[PDB]
């Protein structure tokens, strides 16, 4: 089953870290910009915006630890490697292997959780941060009500103790990944996605080890990630890095949000823009998303 | 090859306008309708129904759509699997037996039918017992992070079709066994009679049965919540004398103190915990049967 090179001109780099390799497509030149995907995707989700960012930046499009073609560190009882704090530290190490100790960061979905956690933990690593269509994990859980529980049911479903989610996801993995992709778009189908991108997501999701990692991610997201976020809320720790919060008008941020109002509690300097899109901003609305990121990141 | 767990109990297929209700019927005395819940069938009562049968005409029904009951075709509002519709269909079923006033004991989903029955048609009930539940409204209202993780299935099975159906269809044995085991005090299948587990597993192996359960949970996330919301915001209380029983390690006690909650819903409620997980009549048969016999008797 052959895939598709969706980043023409970009190189391919297996970045060695102490918890395993990070796969990344690297193109462009200029200030380093790391682009982090989320669930249930891989780096290829940036394929429509990364060329436009590559005009101005050294764009590093990385598979999250455990995701896509990045190595899968062995998990533990606390899902430590798939906590956003550990993923951020592994990505910091990955960026250091490239000589990037101060970089711009745009993240989407899980990658955006890594990204704001990275900004909280190691703010000196970031010139500017963009999070696409998330609120902090703390906020999703604190806003957990009937409406949210149904909308983001997978936050509780995938966090169930193994192997419950894994065994169920195995029941129809192709359906599940496609349903996630479709149900969070504005259209509600797969029409916003490049079918070559969908094949990337389908093949990653077709591996049980990969699905296990994603559940480890959401288990982290229910436990350690929430705890880590809680310490910051209760200690008043704000993200000091210049921040851009993008969200879809029909995405997984706007619901119980005003995402900018939420993010202003979390960051001292945050700008915000709704994007005519569902959750998958870079694929549903690439030009709009790319323009907003280019405008925000162009400086350095 | 399914075992008869109610020796000497009759078998009735009760016609209703919404399809047949299966029921085991035994004993004599005042009518007592027993309703199971998810992911079970009427046979979950097989340890406590005989003791009830010395005192009452025990009717052990499969819920609409569950077990051997017919499955009415659902719709976009999941209407026949709302507790309101289920209550009405069971009212019909009982009327077909000449039972227009009866005692009612419900567990899990069947308890949700029961308290909805008591809110919609209190005149139909002499006494009500609900086993290890709070009103659906109260679960959704207490759905914070801890609870959303605890009863994730309330949100998961409520996802639009065919998402839970498609995940459940890969290995349905695992999930029914997982749900049975996870909600017991012990956390395995030791509390259950293996023959009862076979009943639950065989029912769960039917994709239409599984769909019904999802529709039940979809009704639980939507219409049922809405119906409950109307009552609690109108201050409508259950006037029927009722017993709330719950497992100390069950589900109802995870959200709040069950008796405090039920006193908001019922003007005449008594309560007692039983050392048990969720499945009171199978994990704690003697204690459950004793509590029910005592409460339903004079």
Swiss-Prot record, chain B:
Keyword Hydrolase recorded: yes
Active site residues according to the UniProt entry: 108, 278
EC id: 3.8.1.3
GO molecular function, one term: haloacetate dehalogenase activity
Name of one Pfam family that matches: Abhydrolase_1
Residues that, per the record, bind fluoroacetate: 109, 112, 153-154, 217
Gene3D superfamilies: alpha/beta hydrolase
Domain AB hydrolase-1 stretches: 30-268
Reactions it catalyzes: a haloacetate + H2O = a halide anion + glycolate + H(+); fluoroacetate + H2O = fluoride + glycolate + H(+); chloroacetate + H2O = glycolate + chloride + H(+)
Keywords: Hydrolase
Site residues, Important for enzyme activity: 132
Role: Catalyzes the hydrolytic defluorination of fluoroacetate to produce glycolate. Has lower activity towards chloroacetate and bromoacetate.
Record family assignment: Belongs to the AB hydrolase superfamily. Epoxide hydrolase family.
Subunit structure: Homodimer.
Protein's name in the database: Fluoroacetate dehalogenase
Species, as recorded: Rhodopseudomonas palustris (strain ATCC BAA-98 / CGA009)
